[PDB]
Amino acid sequence: DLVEEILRLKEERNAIILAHNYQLPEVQDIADFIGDSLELARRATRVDADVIVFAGVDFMAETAKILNPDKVVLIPSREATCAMANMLKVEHILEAKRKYPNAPVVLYVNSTAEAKAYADVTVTSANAVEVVKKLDSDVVIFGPDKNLAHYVAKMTGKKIIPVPSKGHCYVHQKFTLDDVERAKKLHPNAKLMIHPECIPEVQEKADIIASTGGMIKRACEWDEWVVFTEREMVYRLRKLYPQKKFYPAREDAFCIGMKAITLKNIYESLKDMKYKVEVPEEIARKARKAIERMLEMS
Ligand SMILES: O=C(O)c1cccnc1C(=O)O
Numbered sequence: 270d271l272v273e274e275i276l277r278l279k280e281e282r283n284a285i286i287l288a289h290n291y292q293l294p295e296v297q298d299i300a301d302f303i304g305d306s307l308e309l310a311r312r313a314t315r316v317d318a319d320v321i322v323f324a325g326v327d328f329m330a331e332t333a334k335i336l337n338p339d340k341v342v343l344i345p346s347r348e349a350t351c352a353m354a355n356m357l358k359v360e361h362i363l364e365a366k367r368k369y370p371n372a373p374v375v376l377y378v379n380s381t382a383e384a385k386a387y388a389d390v391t392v393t394s395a396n397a398v399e400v401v402k403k404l405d406s407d408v409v410i411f412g413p414d415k416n417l418a419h420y421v422a423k424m425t426g427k428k429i430i431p432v433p434s435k436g437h438c439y440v441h442q443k444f445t446l447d448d449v450e451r452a453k454k455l456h457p458n459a460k461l462m463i464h465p466e467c468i469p470e471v472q473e474k475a476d477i478i479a480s481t482g483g484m485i486k487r488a489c490e491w492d493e494w495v496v497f498t499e500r501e502m503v504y505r506l507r508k509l510y511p512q513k514k515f516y517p518a519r520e521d522a523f524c525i526g527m528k529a530i531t532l533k534n535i536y537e538s539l540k541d542m543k544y545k546v547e548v549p550e551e552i553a554r555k556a557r558k559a560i561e562r563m564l565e566m567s
């Protein structure tokens with residue numbers, strides 16, 4: 270079926286499939302590498318294949334292209350996009366820089382390429398605290414996610430200016446204190462791993478506040494977990510740790526953009542060499558500096 274044809278074309282194209290943790294299980298199962306956004310960025314700096322098929326969202330594929338100008342990067346659907354990244358506009362960044370001209374600008378690694386050109390360093394949920402703590406300023410411009418910004422402020426003690434003020438990931442915003450209560454009711458011996466893009470009051474109920482990479486690293490600390498992040502992470506964790514139990518905090522917590530990627534459009538991506546991801550060089554050069562700096566700092 271599609272799996273057999275995909276694998277043949279991957280060989281014919283000298284291609285590698287990189288997948289995010291939130292991809293469908295059947296897509297994770299054909300990927301050469303699976304990770305969070307930080308791990309995907311790092312993995313993109315050691316690509317020896319000629320073609321990268323990105324089972325993720327468009328701005329992640331753009332980050333891979335920024336790091337690999339001489340490789341073909343394919344996004345299987347141009348509708349695979351990130352609602353959180355779309356909330357941040359250049360006008361938000363310019364506005365904040367005029368109010369705080371000496372503050373570093375710290376932006377999520379899969380913001381738009383134009384936004385990343387204004388970043389001094391990029392971050393993800395996995396390294397935001399580590400990076401911001403190392404910056405020598407007590408005020409930081411940070412976005413797009415106001416909930417991650419709040420967590421960073423709490424963990425560093427710095428003043429974190431969120432750009433844009435309402436930016437957030439709708440998937441993580443959904444989680445409520447009622448979901449915490451239901452999780453404790455259903456799995457009283459489970460510990461709660463809660464992503465730092467959840468709202469602060471949900472974060473305060475966590476047994477561990479952790480990025481998805483942190484969820485993998487700290488999963489060894491217990492045998493039973495309820496997972497407050499996008500539901501496909503539960504499949505990823507179950508695959509890594511077949512001896513443990515993982516339960517989604519919400520069955521309906523899914524990223525529509527991530528699920529634009531299908532086995533069928535991965536097959537079509539390799540067959541027809543589409544859709545080719547390109548980033549203008551002036552933007553790419555500035556974004557590359559911020560991404561490479563992030564990788565040096567983490
Ligand atoms: O892997 C991440 O950093 C991540 C964490 C929460 C939500 N989304 C993402 C993403 O990359 O789309």
Ligand code: SF4
Pocket residue numbers: 291326350351352353354438439440441499524525526527
């Ligand atoms: S899960 Fe949230 S931050 Fe990650 S791609 Fe989807 S909308 Fe964007």
Ligand SMILES: [Cl-]
Pocket residue numbers: 285315316317318
């Ligand atoms: Cl490779």
Ligand SMILES: [Cl-]
Pocket residue numbers: 305306393394395480481482
């Ligand atoms: Cl994460």
Ligand SMILES: [Cl-]
Pocket residue numbers: 542543544545
């Ligand atoms: Cl194309």
